[PDB]
Design a protein around this ligand. Structure first.
Ligand code: CL
Ligand code: K
Ligand code: K
Ligand code: ZN
Length: 408
């Protein structure tokens, strides 16, 4: 069974943000137009019984002042109420400004994603679903008491927390962040824990957001940080130079995902699948596609994870070419069904007739309009193997040690 999170209030809230507008609608209406909805099981967003029960759910990761400020900021924006100097300092202190500004529904729009992923996480716990999807989730930048990257409440953190806090021996989660940007928020949320392994495959360069997930800084030469305390060696990162395509990206992360699955054997796998690595994203950093027989990098990684047959949570994320993000994630969904229920779904190369059909112009095709073309990655593989060795030793883990090396 493959679950997917939708609902009228959910659809209204995920489409009420200023940055992502109606992206969530184009995504779900295109999944609907390809007749995939009947094969999917609708997981409804979580809802609490009291305000107190909501706060205790959300302040599982965030602090109460930040959540209070975030609710106040929605209150102030609703009314034409102006922000006093004291209100300005309060908001600034949680970085709710500039890149993460308030709007009439900033708290309800942030909370929706926390509901979707928590619901998707419980769906996996009770074995109702083998894999759950939440394209209105995956905001990996939100931190305990600060907003970043138009991520206000970190749904991913909350959904992982729920997973590890559930009887299996000892539950362990593998987190895999395919977004262009570094999964900093999910990574310091478990920085100190060895039971949640975070691996992010992003772009890094001077001045590029968020600027973490790579060598830092004095101690003469700089080191590459990978967790702390009893969670040392638990956070993995693969920073890639701009202009990588499907093939190299796939060869880049392929061996790293197999190693992590072998050595860790996670109870659950959470996948952030931000679509801003597409060649046609305004960022214009990576050159991935959504092609499927030169197979797409995303789909390649998704297949590799599904083959593990571990309960998997697939979340959306970044992605600012709305129709092309829809193209990508519709495919990701078809794959998920094919790979879980064993049912092969054939998707016509022509975009079906539906509400947002005009947006997919002027060619109205399922593949994004990009013709691909085109080693420090070796250095990273070696560093990542050693780290992986240092991690299994630290946590008294046994593994082939030979088959993992053969993977490269
Ligand atoms: Cl397919
Ligand atoms: K990433
Ligand atoms: K960690
Ligand atoms: Zn991103």
């Amino acid at each position: 069974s493959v679950g997917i999170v939708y609902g009228d209030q959910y659809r209204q809230l995920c489409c009420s943000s200023p940055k992502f507008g109606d992206r969530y609608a184009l995504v779900m209406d295109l999944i609907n137009a390809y007749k995939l909805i009947p094969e999917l099981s609708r997981v409804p967003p979580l809802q609490w019984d009291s305000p107190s029960r909501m706060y205790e759910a959300v302040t599982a990761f965030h602090s109460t002042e930040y959540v209070d400020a975030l609710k106040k900021l929605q209150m102030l924006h609703c009314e034409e109420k102006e922000l006093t100097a004291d209100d300005e300092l309060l908001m600034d202190s949680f970085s709710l400004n500039y890149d993460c500004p308030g709007f009439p529904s900033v708290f309800d729009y942030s909370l929706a994603a926390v509901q979707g992923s928590l619901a998707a996480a419980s769906a996996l716990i009770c074995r109702h679903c083998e894999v759950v999807i939440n394209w209105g989730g995956g905001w990996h930048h939100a931190k305990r008491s600060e907003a970043s990257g138009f991520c206000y409440l970190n749904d991913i953190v909350l959904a992982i927390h729920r997973l590890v806090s559930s009887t299996p021996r000892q539950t362990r989660v593998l987190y895999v962040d395919l977004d262009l940007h570094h999964g900093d928020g999910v990574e310091e949320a478990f920085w100190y824990s060895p039971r949640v392994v975070t691996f992010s495959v992003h772009h890094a360069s001077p001045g590029f957001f968020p600027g973490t997930g790579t060598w830092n800084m004095n101690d003469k030469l700089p080191i590459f940080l990978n967790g702390a305390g009893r969670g040392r060696f638990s956070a993995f990162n693969l920073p890639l130079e701009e202009g990588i395509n499907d093939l190299d990206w796939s060869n880049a992360i392929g061996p790293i995902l197999d190693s992590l699955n072998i050595v860790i054997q996670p109870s659950y796998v959470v996948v952030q699948c931000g679509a801003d690595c597409l060649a046609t994203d305004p960022h214009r950093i990576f050159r991935l596609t959504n092609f499927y027989p030169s197979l797409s990098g995303y789909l390649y990684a998704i297949k590799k994870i599904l083959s593990w047959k571990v309960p998997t949570l697939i979340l959306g994320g970044g992605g600012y070419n709305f129709p092309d993000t829809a193209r990508l994630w519709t495919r990701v969904t078809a794959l998920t069904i094919e790979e879980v229920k064993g049912k092969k779904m054939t998707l016509s190369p022509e975009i079906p007739e539906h509400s947002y059909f005009s947006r997919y112009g002027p060619d109205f095709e399922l593949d994004i309009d990009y013709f691909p073309h085109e080693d420090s990655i070796q250095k990273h593989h070696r560093r990542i193997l050693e780290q992986l060795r240092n991690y299994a030793d630290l946590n008294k883990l046994i593994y082939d040690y030979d088959q993992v090396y053969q993977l490269y």
